[PDB]
Design a protein around this ligand. Sequence first.
Ligand SMILES: [Mg+2]
Ligand SMILES: [Zn+2]
Ligand SMILES: [Zn+2]
Lengths: 422, 50, 107, 99, 739, 50, 125, 248, 120, 50
Amino acid sequence: DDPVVQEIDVYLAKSLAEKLYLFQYPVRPASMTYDDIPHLSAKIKPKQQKVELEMAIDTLNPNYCRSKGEQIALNVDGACADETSTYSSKLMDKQTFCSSQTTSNTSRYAAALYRQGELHLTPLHGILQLRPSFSYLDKADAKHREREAANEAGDSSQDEAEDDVKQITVRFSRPESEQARQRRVQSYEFLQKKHAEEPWVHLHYYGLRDSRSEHERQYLLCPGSSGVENTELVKSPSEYLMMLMPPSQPSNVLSMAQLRTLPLADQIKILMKNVKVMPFANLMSLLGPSIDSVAVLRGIQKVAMLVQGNWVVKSDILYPKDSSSPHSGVPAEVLCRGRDFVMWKFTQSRWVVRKEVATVTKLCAEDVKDFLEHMAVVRINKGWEFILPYDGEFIKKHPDVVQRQHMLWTGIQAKLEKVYNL
Amino acid sequence: ETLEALILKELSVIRDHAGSACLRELDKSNSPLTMALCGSKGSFINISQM
Amino acid sequence: MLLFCPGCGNGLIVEEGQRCHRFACNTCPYVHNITRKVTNRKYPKLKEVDDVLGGAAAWENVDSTAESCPKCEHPRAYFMQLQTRSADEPMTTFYKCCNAQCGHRWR
Amino acid sequence: RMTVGKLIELLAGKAGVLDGRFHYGTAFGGSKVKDVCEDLVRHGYNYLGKDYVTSGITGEPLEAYIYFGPVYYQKLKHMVLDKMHARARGPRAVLTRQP
Amino acid sequence: INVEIKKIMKANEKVTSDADPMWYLKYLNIYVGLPDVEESFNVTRPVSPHECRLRDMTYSAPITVDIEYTRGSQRIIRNALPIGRMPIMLRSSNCVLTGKTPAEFAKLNECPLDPGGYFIVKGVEKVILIQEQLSKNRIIVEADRKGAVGASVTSSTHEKKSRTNMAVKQGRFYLRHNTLSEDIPIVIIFKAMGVESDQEIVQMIGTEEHVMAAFGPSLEECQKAQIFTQMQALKYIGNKVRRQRMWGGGPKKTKIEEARELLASTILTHVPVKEFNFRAKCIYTAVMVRRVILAQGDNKVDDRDYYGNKRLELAGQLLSLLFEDLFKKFNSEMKKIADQVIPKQRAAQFDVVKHMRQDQITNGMVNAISTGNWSLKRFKMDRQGVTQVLSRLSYISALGMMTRISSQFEKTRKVSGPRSLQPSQWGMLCPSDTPEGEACGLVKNLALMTHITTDMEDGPIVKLASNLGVEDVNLLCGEELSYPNVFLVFLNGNILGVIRDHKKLVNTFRLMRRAGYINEFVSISTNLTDRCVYISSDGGRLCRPYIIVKKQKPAVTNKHMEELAQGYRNFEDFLHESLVEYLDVNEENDCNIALYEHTINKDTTHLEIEPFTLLGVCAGLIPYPHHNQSPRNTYQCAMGKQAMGTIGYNQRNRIDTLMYLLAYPQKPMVKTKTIELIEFEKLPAGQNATVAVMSYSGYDIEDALVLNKASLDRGFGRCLVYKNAKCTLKRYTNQTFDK
Amino acid sequence: TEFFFHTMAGREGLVDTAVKTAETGYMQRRLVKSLEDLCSQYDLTVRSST
Amino acid sequence: LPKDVSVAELLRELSLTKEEELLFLQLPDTLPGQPPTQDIAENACTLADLTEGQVGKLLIRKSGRVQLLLGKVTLDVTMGTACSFLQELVSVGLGDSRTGEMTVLGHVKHKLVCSPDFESLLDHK
Amino acid sequence: PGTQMTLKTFHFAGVASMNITLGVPRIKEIINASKAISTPIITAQLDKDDDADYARLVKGRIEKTLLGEISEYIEEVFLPDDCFILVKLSLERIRLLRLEVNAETVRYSICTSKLRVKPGDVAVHGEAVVCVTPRENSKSSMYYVLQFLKEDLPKVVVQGIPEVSRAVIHIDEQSGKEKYKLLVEGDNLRAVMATHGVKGTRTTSNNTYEVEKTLGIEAARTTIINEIQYTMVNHGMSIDRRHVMLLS
Amino acid sequence: ENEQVSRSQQRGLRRVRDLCRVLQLPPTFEDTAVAYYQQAYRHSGIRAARLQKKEVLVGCCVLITCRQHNWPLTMGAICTLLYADLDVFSSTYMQIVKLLGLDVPSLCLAELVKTYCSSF
Amino acid sequence: ADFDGDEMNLHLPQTEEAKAEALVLMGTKANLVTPRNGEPLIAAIQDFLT
Ligand SMILES: [Mg+2]
Ligand SMILES: [Zn+2]
Ligand SMILES: [Zn+2]
């Protein structure tokens, strides 16, 4: 699927980044708009964005009930007080639209102005949802309560001078606990008072039909050339995947992922500890092509020996000097001597009988079995055969390694013959 | 429910026909067959199921 | 049908007006007069069934055919096998031999 | 009780003790009946377990062949020695003078 | 003992008293140490579990703590202070038995084949059973006792648990809560939750004609009253709020603010409100009412026995809750002692070091483990029978009891619903293994291959979901919930948002989890009937490994298995290379599994590892179990849990109240692979006898068997019974002793 | 799958019999406690306790 | 109304007619780029940190495949929730401390969503 | 026999429907002699047992029929003069189910314990057209009562016995002649035996209290004996009739 | 009895309890200590005393309790957990051992070494 | 019973009248049939029928 058509260029504009707000009416369908509705007031605070709109609705229209309007207007306000009136006339004229904050981090949401072949993105400073609020009913209820209080006061014709002296007892400076203080801070009244402490800012509205709308509409564009390579946004896919998903922070417990994050001297060590029989060819693939062969050789010569072309882990590597036999409890030195004798017998002849080595090393049957099961398999009628065949190509490619291994095996055989009296 | 009943009927027909075939092919002196005939323990249904 | 007012999105009810019945809201003076017929059907479910049952063809939805019942020893049969017994390890049979309307029912 | 698995285990154990092997009784797998039948026919026994058996009491052979085989029998803790309980007059309860 | 206890200490790091300010007690760090015995005078000493078994004493480790406090407004710090003793489970991190060779086990008089996993208190071995409980923070739609289709939400946070119920008794939806005197209409609650327009509420509920027809009575009942603002609805709710009988007044009016606070935190605790903003809670309850309306039609009643809604609580969470309760009680006691002592004692300075009651926590833990009763007054949790005496009849008995699970019903009523065998137990719980009697169906055993997940962090999950196109719930109205193509994404019951093309989202999430950047235990499931995408990450869930199959071929080949056998790779490498992955019940509900290679078809997502893993531990002992009746297998498991035989290598030195041993035990001839996996052949519980299948002498009528006298004479069936007789010589209060 | 379904049926039968035992015991106790005062008299008439 | 698709959407927006249209799109929280001298910790590279000019190319492939190249990676663009209520885009320009000009930019009809292509990133490395 | 009781299923008595409580629960409900029992079964014998037309006729006569079950659509019609509710009856379904119900019978069904609906409120215009005009009752009621009317009108009884919930036509496969009986899931035996076209002399039931209060203590005892013996025989175990005779 | 237990006697017995609990002593030591306290509180001169006197009496009682069952514990470690001085503690100890004359075993040196070396 | 480990009780009367009543009324030969329907219960069983 080739991107044949519509190679739209995506431009960015910072002219109206902090001045762009997304308002939506969940109760008003997209078919009907508020273009014909005369806007009266728009009270919005810069900090803690909560806009409040005052819409004007007509009365002479047949869809409006003048009697109910007069009734609700007389209910919300006083008879002829008019000092603080929600409606100038005796009719319900203003409708209050209150806003609610959708989300805090609106940086991931942007407005996309689409033109003929180009798309301009503009960040949003905030997004609010507008809903028709019912605030005149609360004021009407408060006025009904104050009328009831006035009736309770004037229950009699003339009220004598009451002795309503405010008792002189100021609130004591009681030490408030931390829990009660936190409850006061988290109380809805405290948050409402904190939001109300910010003064309102009255702004003049301008409709879509106004020329100012068309004047400011061009500000969403950015003055720039058609094709310009951006200096940023050049991270590799790996860096992107790492930055979008940041990290949080038997002896074969370490996995391959934890294996590769280790020096080769320990990687080959734990590999020879887990397998105990490893060819050089497959070891090159396991270690990786990025590692030279000379380093792998100089490392494996310290933790392994060559037998019939195959690398076998050293006895002291599997059995530390402080450990003991899990089957018999004998010290690890005798186990290492027995394993070296087994390896020497394998270097001498490919076939080894368990009875001979058991009689020579004077070890138990289970120890001899655990020794032979590492590098040999049970072959009937002949005893045991090495698990891997002869590796001649590795010997031909590295004669000095084989020579040094044989030089070490000479002393190993000397010590074994001195100990076991072969 | 009609489909479920028809499927149950077909499966049970298969079971009964297999049981009849097994009872016909079984030779005499068979201990399960003899026990099912005498009624001491078991029945033809158990033999067909086994 | 549930109608809502464009002014405040509240529920609209029917109320008799000075000249014609109209949809009105209990919170705002917004009203909407009725010009022509406005209907809202429901189309409830009709009992299309006849509730006929007991036919011998539908009754013989059973497996056992051409067996030997211990009552009249005739091919026709209607067996039921039950396994809901733990005290009694073997299963349970219920045979219904009925061609001449004998009505055989036993264990 | 349709315990055919017991017969299969018996046959497998007989084949094993004949050939010195441990046949597996793994669920939905294990050694099949054909292999143990071949082992039986190789070792000289009947391929179905049933063998020619003579009665020990009368000394005459039985009419039907008998099913012999090594089976894993396990004894339970429920023994009659710990369940036998007789009651003489004995003691009684303090509140109500009953045993 | 390594993570959760530190969080518990951090939650109660600082404790102070109201009286005498500037005084405080701050916990700096804690340690659990190694198990020791207090036999020596004020001196500890390493002690083996076998010694604790013999001496009839507990096997616990003392807790050390370093703290800081003030005596005379002077900061005094500490380094190591006892506060109690935690019982140490065997073969744990701090246990001496871990990382030991069989020779070292012999030196400590402990069998290496012993499975462990049990505490030792006063010389007896107690095992904490795996508790099974309904998953919390999830809407449950079920038929009422009168036949109505209602809903319930058990909103459980770390502090409170509230069960909000829904009622459709009169064609309209009421909400019932314990803190409310009478159930109130849902529309009044909606108006009190911030949203006042009826059109918005209807859009949030749904746009289907039948949905509006069903919700009409609720709107009519709401319009009956004059409730049209949030203040009036809050007033009505507060009028319907019970009297809590709290010493003190309300915030502002004691009538409206109390209702607001109840709607904020008390009702739907799991649903969070940032700053008194119920929009997310509004959408949640709207989706709930929509589900109730959808269930009011077709009878798609959810079933409780579905294990996708079950959770397994181990001993870890129980001990964590108990330690939290004990630490809170200790802090309250310290605060009370301070408030009693420091104000008016004398000019001298008081300090809490003189009141470090170490016997409190130790005695609480010992009693809770021994008696088995768990009493949590902070959560009203009164449980019993959690801990049980480990059955030492045989090795198989203990191995099976170590993997037991009890039910929440605890024989309250013979419902027979949960007692049945459900398909959800596939590959997770042993179907055949179950106790015979009244406990049938309420006590179960885990499968041979299973694992229980742990609690996650849910941070990167939310980040990935937000980056995968999940729109904000507050950014849109509820009408989009009525669209058929829009699906809902949640997180452990918390509503996360909406999404389109749920197939792409599920595939991307599964691929990201297989990549290794997301924990493999995080489960994702899809419900097309409810159109909801559930993301489950809480602990207690059941997961099973499965081989990933793509394009009609398994991801694991013969070469991978050869490298595994040779030691080149392990199971964790299969988990990392996207070859084997864990699947939850809810996750496998949407996936296709194949039992064998020949059964693999085009629409296959995973391959079954091994079929015989379906059975548990005891059922594995049955040779050829698929050739036998299931009640026979159940009775066989029940009898094998009581079969006599060898217990361990240290059975001779072990001194129990009752022990049964076999004179000449023999390993079975027909052995299952499970036997070799559990090393039962090393500790058999029976013999191999030549059996004849025939009737003889009429003494084998019903289940009876005739034995051979010569066989019994030569040692066949011989058994040994070991009983314990204990006596104590204690010194009383007076200076006299038993002689 | 067949083994799982067979185990389902077995457990269903087990729980059915388990409930049936207790229910039958209770109803038997009630019925015998009710019908214990009846006896066959010599005049061939079954009379109550009173 | 039947459900549309982004490719046909752009086709009818440009090929069928030349009339402009105001759109709204959701973008990932983190962009494949580094904030240039923005005083950073691998935080989210928001659009405000970037400058003007061309930043990416919208590609429309065969069979309805639509992508957005923003450098070395390509995100997938799909249709969001089809809003039916009134969503208008306006600018609240506070030219003065106590006086501001609200300009009605237009009406928003469709909603787009851009998500990183995790499959391609995992197939790469 | 409770010990040997199976608590089985699928024993629909040959109709593959009409789930009836049988066994230990049935024995308990019988011995408790409660006035109200679960799933009451009434057996009715007809005169013209060979004809299915008369069978369905008496079925519709005895079975409770709701207005919404026969009406094809009920619509709230708002007109400029006044708003009301219009119900259209499906005459095809009326003549198909052989229900002796016309517009006049539907009108007579209304005004029966429905918030004092006056006869002048309900009107008939066509053959299957019913008009219901709302009127406020002044007790917390206004002209906006069309919602309650639309909700409660389809659930009104127009033909049959209110106690009757479901009635089915069972047939017998007798070789001599195939006869039809009625199985009614109601708890009003008096109304069943009193309806036209039903042979009341051969009408049985399962509710012991209703049979008692309808036909005497002897008929109650006979019905108890018959029901106990039937329930016992249906599950494979036999009990001598003298035991249940003494119990009754 | 056990109802004529003054608030001060209750405070004293609770002090004995917490003092023997912070030392991680077996319940037998607690029983013996509360028995010794109830026995020593029978005197008129002991019951009519100050809080310092009751506290040093609790200290001496738990000291005698530990001295009984071969449990070595120096007086310094006890006075460390008491809100008083050691001189008045010793004076009250001498007074009560002169008034009661109970058995006072000698402090064993080997057990004291065993208790003291482990603290390092 | 099924002889699978089930325990059984055994009571011994301490009065000649009780012994005679047990031998006569509760005699095994005198209770070969159940009073429910007259069907005999003490009869041949498995391994005897075959
Ligand atoms: Mg038995
Ligand atoms: Zn309105
Ligand atoms: Zn027949």
